[PDB]
């Protein structure tokens, strides 16, 4: 269903000088981690439609030139270990950017693993920082987080005249 | 002495909702945020940088509203946001050079 319109050579020629270097093949590694079925003491509802998000991002990132890694229904501990393993991969030394997408239930500042346990987002970003991930120093790192940050529903407000 | 780097820089993080709030997911179309993200990135990665594309995503999310009659989510809203430590434009340059 998705189609990525290519950039023109003139566009590259007039915009590469003020942008991050982004021309490697692959453009970078991308990781899509989706948790949809939860089974811990802390009960969390099955995320119907999560399958659509997962396939949509895998496709999108592939079309954008990334080597896509996928992980599904992982515990908090498994997420931490495998995200650290992903950040530590040698392939980052020869790519120009990185993409990590996390899709699950969550609370402010943290996401749930399928065991109903939390992984703090600060620890996740730290795995990719300049101190812990030298291979990605100065390279653009994108993160997309589809997860709740609390349980308050926004009722919205009417536009005022 | 050689310039050093701050501990964390050059990251951009897009969130489907704001602190304290729930993010919305449609059972057939998937999450509002991911749906918008894919729509905008696929059509605009060719001529718009990532932070600007996330602004277009914000515009789509701000206008969307919940469909779930008889539940607490009917006509609900959500607002996505992004935070950035990027230090220059982030163009993905899809298709350049050709394949």
């Amino acid at each position: 269903c998705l189609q990525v319109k290519p950039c023109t050579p003139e566009f590259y020629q007039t915009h590469f000088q003020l942008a991050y270097r982004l021309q490697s093949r692959p453009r970078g590694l991308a990781l899509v981690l989706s948790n949809v079925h939860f089974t811990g003491e802390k009960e969390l509802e099955f995320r119907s439609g999560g399958d659509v998000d997962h396939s949509t991002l895998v496709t999108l990132f592939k079309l954008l030139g990334y080597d896509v890694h996928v992980l599904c229904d992982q515990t908090a501990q498994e997420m931490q270990e495998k995200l650290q393993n992903f950040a530590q991969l040698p392939a980052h030394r020869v790519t120009d950017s990185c993409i990590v997408a996390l899709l699950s239930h969550g609370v402010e500042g943290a996401i749930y693993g399928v065991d109903g346990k939390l992984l703090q987002l600060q620890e996740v970003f730290q795995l990719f920082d300049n101190a812990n991930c030298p291979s990605l120093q100065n390279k653009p790192k994108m993160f997309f987080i589809q997860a709740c940050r609390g349980d308050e529903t926004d009722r919205g407000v009417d536009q005022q005249d | 002495p050689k310039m050093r780097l701050p501990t964390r820089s050059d990251m951009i993080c897009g969130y489907a909702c704001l602190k304290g709030t729930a993010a919305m997911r449609n059972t057939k179309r998937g999450s509002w945020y991911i749906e918008a993200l894919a729509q905008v990135f696929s059509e605009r990665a060719c001529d718009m940088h990532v932070a600007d594309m996330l602004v277009k995503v914000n515009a789509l999310i701000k206008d969307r509203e919940g469909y779930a009659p008889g539940t607490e989510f009917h006509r609900c809203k959500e607002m996505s946001e992004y935070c950035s430590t990027l230090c220059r434009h982030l163009y993905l340059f899809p298709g350049h050079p050709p394949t």
Binding site: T153 | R25, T27
Partner: peptide, 5 residues
């Protein structure tokens, strides 16, 4: 229908 994450 729309559900919360």
């Amino acid at each position: 229908l729309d559900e919360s994450x």
